[PDB]
Design a protein around this ligand. Structure first.
Ligand code: NA
Lengths: 298, 302
């Protein structure tokens, strides 16, 4: 059971942004509303949008921002990469302590999903190696904002811009930089073949050991290079020395060296589960980071 | 790959979470209007928990024995009473963040979100179902201060669950907000264990309909089954029996897809026999049973 962060601090920041007939979700922090810049495009604009030119043709009156039933008056607009910044005449009184951060594939965060024009659900996820996010099967989302919470500080890391044909979404950080080889233009785009986040699977095996689920431990230890040869065969991400270092705390806590756990994982890949489960699951979980496990399993 | 279930946004409940301390025992309470609800075993020592006599423990308490903290603000308790297994502390301030709310008792198979507290504050939210054996599958639950379960329908929070105990297998058990336990469990540290759990068959069938609606059909077959034959097979896999009520409930999805309910039962029978052979349904390599017909009809009948 993966948990998301409590979403209340972000809920107070979700607003609806309308340009023409397009309405989508924006993030209201102090006196700025952040949203995908493609809100300014028409159907025909998307085929080859000149966003800088389209934006200068736009005026403050072209934007309608609503926080609940209160309209926010737009008093200026600028673009930062693929994110539109709408200066509004009112600072959000619910603005939490926050910062904008960029995460790496394999790292986890919570998504507050908007449906029918307001925040509707929250889930925990990992950014896939192919930079997409496995969201809800429900289509027609008005957008999504991804975040982590550390103490009282919300670290915003993701904003959804598009749905991909496979049921996943793709997006930017809050400075408008895309994650992955995607563009906010109407053009043929597909997620690349995805792979399993190996360092997270190892983190989760450590969680299993901490919770007393040990049947999969074996006496063997492999090498980083021998393991990666097997990992590649099974569409697992290569393990790096950095990953090994990251797992260090869990190795010290459990007494299972990383390359020792890698040999357990190699065997699980090559031979299967043999009718057993781990932490009650018949499948290996790759949406817990090492930091998630350390934090939740002491 | 599992099915991506969403929890309700937890903000409306976060505004109601408070800390309740009795002696050395601190746990989560729910502050609604001028009442704080929490498990009555907050008044127990570790010794008491084997055979607590709650009436005897409570008659000896005064209002000022209860420490209630809402953030860095201390709430003054001005009365207290016990309703079944829940303690109700009247405080001198109505919670200004109280949402529209009601208390409801749910049935096994129903879903709800859980706002989990850890280390003395809300720390995580997840979506779950009340299992057929009346337990909740939680997270790692290392040092939980409690949990509150809820649904949110049109800005009204329906509170349906409060966690009281962790059971040996890592699941938890608890009560409705009137303090009545779900299942045969008691708020006493004595040998009690969850019965064998079973899969929520009607939920799996609703989710298969959601899959067809969203364009997944590889698992359909040309067979049907009688209701009794299906139940004889399903129970061999530890699936819950399907009732005529369940058949009625799936009616709208059958009418939407053109697939008779007992035809979908034949498909489920075949999926249990074959597995998924490396394929997914709605992105999931597992059969999902924590998505109810109500939510499917709502999110897919459109
Ligand atoms: Na080993």
């Amino acid at each position: 059971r993966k948990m998301a962060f409590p979403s209340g601090k972000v809920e107070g920041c979700m607003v609806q942004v309308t340009c023409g007939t397009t309405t989508l979700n924006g993030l209201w922090l102090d006196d700025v509303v952040y949203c995908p810049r493609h809100v300014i495009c028409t159907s025909e604009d998307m085929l080859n949008p000149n966003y800088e030119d389209l934006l200068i043709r736009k005026s403050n009156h072209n934007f309608l921002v609503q926080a609940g039933n209160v309209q926010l008056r737009v008093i200026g607009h600028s673009m930062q990469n693929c994110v539109l910044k709408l200066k509004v005449d009112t600072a959000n009184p619910k603005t939490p302590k926050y910062k904008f951060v960029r995460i790496q594939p394999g790292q986890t965060f919570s998504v507050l999903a908007c449906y029918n024009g307001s925040p509707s659900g929250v889930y925990q996820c990992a950014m896939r190696p192919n930079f997409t996010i496995k969201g809800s099967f429900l289509n027609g989302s008005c957008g999504s904002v991804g975040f982590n919470i550390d103490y009282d500080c919300v670290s915003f890391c993701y904003m959804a811009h598009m749905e991909l044909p496979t049921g996943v979404h793709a997006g930017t950080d809050l400075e408008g930089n895309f994650y992955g080889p995607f563009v906010d233009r109407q053009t043929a785009q597909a997620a690349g073949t995805d792979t399993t986040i190996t360092v997270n699977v190892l983190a989760w095996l450590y969680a299993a050991v901490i919770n007393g689920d040990r049947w999969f431990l074996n006496r063997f230890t492999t090498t980083l290079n021998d393991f990666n040869l097997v990992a590649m065969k099974y569409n697992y991400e290569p393990l790096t020395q950095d990953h090994v270092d990251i797992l260090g705390p869990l190795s010290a806590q459990t007494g299972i060296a990383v390359l020792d756990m890698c040999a357990s994982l190699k065997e699980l890949l090559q031979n299967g589960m043999n009718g057993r489960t781990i932490l009650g699951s018949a499948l290996l979980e790759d949406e817990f980071t090492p930091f998630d496990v350390v934090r939740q399993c002491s």
